[PDB]
Symmetry: C3
Subunit: 562 residues, 3 copies
């Protein structure tokens, strides 16, 4: 006795089983003409159950047909089909709720899906997932709600660590969306603090794409570790909408990871980290056109191994990474090339440290271009700004490259008195040859940003300003940069020199630059002052000379080794 | 002619094919009522083969039914069904043995399995695997044996490197177990040295969980590279049972890797590494409540990028990482936050180096708490102990944080004579103002642990002890710590000061502390002696002062920059 | 009405549907006896379409049978079967072309495949892939063509970033091949510069194996990021055939990554990187018997975290990593053990830097053996060579180990004048006790490679040559190495000493060596001159002594700390 065949589920429901003596029936498709989700049912003929659609379906007569499952469970089996104007959220929700019992893995079919409603999907990593192998796409333009996907675990501590990482939680989902207020994408954890303390560890989210949301990815309470494997979010609505963490989080943030992640195409959108005791790692990921901002009350540690910072096409002057306000937090970049393309000026500092915060760079190369003009906004011409402290080791700082190179941060200055903060002539040796009365005094409260300026007014003879510093870590780079203002110019009043000496005061070489003629506050150190120290150097001597007549003034006279 | 239908395999075996003229038959399920593993057979009717259950099954008459395979091969097809009291090991073994021929991938069905017997499973990475997508769970409580899973390759060199990494060896397996002697989990390689030198490279083990075993994971002979992708083992029986490597291994240990691995919930269990020329890498993994111990005869190199060390809830005083005994081996932590929670005292050193061994830390932050009391066990109050050497670069060493901060290791002390090992008053400048006869001599064989103490007994005038050291790497942290004993106290005999000077001996600032009144061996340097060096500092001056009257003694007078 | 059954596709084509009134038909296998790729068709009976084989097949009568698809799409369904002499390339090409429409994922069946023809496969990451779960193997010995696999995306910018990483592009493929000119394997991007600028980002290539090709993997135009997850290529035809990048690439090379990759068994084959602004990262991968060569016009940045360099069995003297010619590029090794096995001499430098190029090493151990003889080819006995600059931090440089240890690179020498490049007696203090006329002058244009030699000819009294240097980073290693030539030998004219001093000139220890008797240019510093600096050392003093009578000469007198 071969089983009966049904073209559509409506026909199966219509047919009465009073006189039908059969063990099983076979449906070719749940929808007429779709040809998807074929299934095998067995008639119970007397028992009563919940009566779901995909499983234990109910007919008009009353008998319920129990589905038999072979291999993986498909979510399109219930009611889901690829379309552009057919709702499929109830079918997916019912399939996931059924898969929660006798926990297994839930798979989505191919094609573009459409979902609408007012409720999101509660993904439990310890129970099931929405993993889709064949590049599933869902549409959420018509859908309205706070969150489409929220990931949390109901189990407190007993079964969650035992079986949480056996399979991924969400794979192969491309979500559409529109730019409206109050509608976001995926939340990790729980939106509310009350309830049971969730334990969702080792939860995977791989090969998924979110876009056109107010908050692409948001971190909630009790989401301490998550593995994002190659996820990219783009085109957020407002600033800080790509990856958000509220400051009111509790007991969360234990070594989150990103594996070849990406954040790009940010039309006025940022990424903000604001939490206490929050650890994050990036491995071999590049995010571009994104301003990575950090303002946390307590220590937040973010590390980046092989992270690429760039901007392929943009005329904006946004800065790459900044720390706005914090007590003490760290930023780590290891072995990731940084490249800046052409722009119509920058007038900004690419990376910013404030208060007591620190960024550490290692195995890095520092690019330079002819369109930085960093000195316009933050005084000294350098690659950084702010009162924070920057420590770097083994950085390349490529030499040559047309215009030249620039210092990274003034905190690495070998000279103890560069910005004239000592309020006197300390640490600077002045020599007025032959006739006295040459003016080389120091006045304060006048400068590009308020720092003191050390002007020299020599008459009928030159004056020499010399200082000696000690080098560290053997060979390095010089990366000179000095702000120079010339109130009166009659000739080439230049000849600013830097010399290398060994431990026994023997000359090994040097570089010299000439002060220009323009009146405005120029920068000297773009070229003809860079180089690599000869092997065996011990000390660096700075000399500043002015010819008789024209009087000048200098500021931010700083070296920056390696 | 539609094929015949069979509800159960027993019915198919019973039915005689003498008068049956058919090409194929269809079974709905191998077990009656299970509804799993439906299959299609074709009758051979005359040929003779081995007569396995899943493939080329044999009937009572004698004819053998050859199974036809479409798509992937399912292991539950043979005899396996999800249950709690039904044995399934023979079915899995037969399925894997059949999959070894015409090598393919073997998939397990969903649900909780049960296995028992006395033999383990020999997984050959170059032939097949036990990859299970839908979160397969097996039970091994009733099972007895040396090893449930042993991974090795029979091929020597010809076909093994060619096709070994094409697919994973074991995926989606959660194993149960009980705490009994002699029963362990997964072994990599061969348990015996004799035989053919196996070549099992690029073998994957992903999304699997082991627990309640004597040895959760053990490494055997000829297991030189293995990729553990998000594996966690917990609740071992004895110490060192989570990840074991015997010292008798040969030609093994070439750059093993762990990707977001985990070791936690260790109830008196450790992880031990003891091998010669053994390389291991950790990437973005956190193991907690685990004492990572290393005692190897020769060089063992373990690196950790983004590794988190912590203890969420525990009152134990266990130490995180230790090197017990070795010739010369290295430990590497890069960009992984270390956090210590509240405890009722520590009385131990969190990380330990012995003999000539070294740990290197970089891009790290050093936490501090008010419940360390590290000075109780290993003399000086510091974050380390032992005769080993510790080198760190770019470490954060957060400042402030309530009580303060502590030095990491004494080997970074800038002062050449801190523990009074010179057996004299060298490197210390003593000044007894006005009247002589003030006693500041040095006596040995008396101290907290046996090191010498430099006591001062000044009368009717104070005595000053001064030393000068040179700073490196520009700005850093101070992290003062000194053991102080006061035999007699009459007033505030304090005023221990530290001052910063530039290259030209100009004052830039300083920090001072006051010696207490309690008789016992206190520590000074928890607070009011920490700070960040001003930009441009060159030298650090240490001054120790004692008021006339009370006599004191100091030990472990050490600075620790960065 | 049960559907009709067809054993073979030829029988289905032969049967006429004029009088057949049926809705669907079922084929057991496309080939007779194969028993693979069973499928369900529905008769259109009047419509006209393209008439492909796997989909919408066409019969002899004229009616076309539309296939119905359930779950994933299988590529073996069209015409592919595992064999050794049956062509399957047209079937795979047709299956991929059909899968491009209504984009989904394409899966290959098990068994060894055979492909032949003259055209390659155009894999579009944004459309479909050739992912094969069950270890698919294809044979390309008979196949002839420029490239078997070429990966590129036709989309410019609109839909490519939106949906590119949803699934892998190629998984589980083992390709065979023969060593012939003009036949290679997988190319990324486009072979020609003209056309549309492709955007193929986040494209995965995992668990695949290539061998016996002229160019195993080649990078083409517009291939800026690719994720190679555990790929290994071996046995290339010519040199530089394992992983090739032409110098004519445009707008490509943004942070490429390798995850546990491998390159081994290279029979006269190399890996060459030649491109401008090219970023590459290696994570936990080991490549052996491969000479990693870099010669790029502009800055190329390659980083390696946990990379293992070794040679299990080989008598060759090839060098591990070299930079032939470049402006300024960087090489980064972090936390990856380097081990060298036994050999019948080396006579070469293992790692090579040229011109202004730099390699940075960190968290590394430097092995040593008794069969290096590095001084034979490149003058000084060291672990490096060339005019480039090497910077290292936190390196282990294991001590002891039989013969001893060797310096890494001369650019870290603490002495300013080691190779006698000053053309005089500067930086060297000479003391001729008692009688003058002892000869210690310097002559040039004579030496092992042309550098000057400082010979001493003392009579009736010894002469002492002393120098003082400053130590950095506190404790380190010495790693002495000096070339010594003895023209005349009458006794033990040795006693070359190195001493440690603190900041106040107090002895802390030292190491001494004795010059031999052999006439030839020997090396001194293999043993009895290594050690770890005591805690608190500040200066290192070098002393060279010669007894009266025999006259000697020294060259490359260099220390190398850490």
């Amino acid at each position: 006795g071969q089983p009966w065949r049904f073209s559509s589920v409506a026909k199966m429901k219509a047919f009465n089983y009073s006189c039908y003596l059969g063990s099983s029936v076979f449906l070719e498709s749940w929808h007429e003409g779709a040809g998807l989700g074929s299934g095998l049912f067995k008639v119970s003929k007397g028992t009563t159950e919940v009566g779901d659609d995909g499983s234990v379906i109910v007919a008009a007569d009353g008998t319920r047909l129990i589905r038999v499952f072979d291999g993986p469970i498909f979510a399109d089996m219930w009611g889901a089909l690829p379309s552009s104007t057919y709702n499929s959220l109830p079918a997916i929700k019912s399939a996931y709720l059924y898969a929660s019992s006798k926990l297994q893995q839930l798979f989505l079919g191919g094609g573009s899906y459409k979902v609408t409603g007012s409720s999101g999907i509660d993904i439990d990593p310890s129970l099931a997932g929405i993993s889709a192998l064949s590049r599933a796409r869902v549409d959420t333009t018509e859908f309205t709600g706070d969150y489409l996907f929220t990931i949390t675990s109901s189990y407190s501590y007993t079964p969650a660590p035992y079986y949480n990482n056996l399979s991924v939680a969400l794979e192969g989902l491309y979500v559409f969306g529109n730019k409206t207020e109050g509608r976001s994408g995926l939340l990790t954890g729980r939106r509310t603090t009350d309830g049971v303390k969730s334990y969702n560890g080792q939860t995977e989210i791989r090969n998924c794409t979110f876009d056109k949301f107010d908050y692409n990815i948001r971190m909630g309470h009790n989401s301490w570790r998550i593995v994002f494997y190659k996820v990219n979010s783009l085109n957020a609505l407002n600033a800080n909408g790509i990856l958000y963490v509220p400051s009111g989080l509790d007991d969360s943030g234990e070594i989150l990871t990103f594996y070849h992640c990406q954040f790009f195409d940010g039309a006025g959108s940022n990424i903000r980290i604001s939490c206490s005791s929050f650890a994050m790692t990036f491995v071999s990921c590049s995010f571009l056109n994104i301003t990575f901002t950090i303002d946390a009350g307590s220590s937040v540690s973010v590390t980046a191994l092989g992270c690429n910072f760039e901007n392929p096409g943009s005329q904006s002057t946004r800065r790459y990474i900044e720390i706005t306000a914090g007590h003490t937090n760290i930023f780590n970049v290891v072995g990731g090339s940084i490249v800046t393309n052409a722009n119509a000026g920058q007038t900004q500092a690419l990376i910013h440290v404030s208060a007591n915060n620190q960024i550490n760079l290692s195995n890095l190369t520092i690019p330079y271009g002819a369109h930085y003009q960093q000195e316009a906004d933050s005084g000294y011409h350098a690659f950084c700004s702010g009162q924070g402290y920057v420590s770097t080791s083994n950085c390349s700082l490529q030499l040559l490259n047309g215009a030249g190179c620039c210092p990274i941060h003034p905190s690495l200055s070998v000279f103890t008195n560069w910005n004239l903060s000592y309020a006197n002539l300390n640490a600077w040796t002045v020599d007025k040859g032959s006739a006295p009365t040459s003016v080389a005094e120091y006045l304060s409260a006048q400068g590009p940003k308020g720092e003191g300026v050390l002007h020299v007014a020599p008459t009928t003879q030159g004056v020499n300003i010399s200082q000696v510093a000690t080098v560290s870590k053997q060979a390095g780079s010089m990366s000179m940069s000095v702000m120079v203002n010339i109130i009166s110019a009659s000739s080439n009043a230049g000849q600013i020199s830097l010399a290398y000496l060994d431990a026994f005061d023997n000359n090994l070489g040097g570089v010299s630059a000439n002060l220009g003629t323009t009146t405005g506050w120029k920068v000297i150190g773009k070229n003809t002052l860079r180089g690599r120290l000869p092997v065996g150097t011990a000390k660096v001597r700075l000399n500043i000379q002015t010819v008789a007549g024209a009087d000048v003034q200098y500021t931010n006279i700083l070296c920056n080794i390696i």
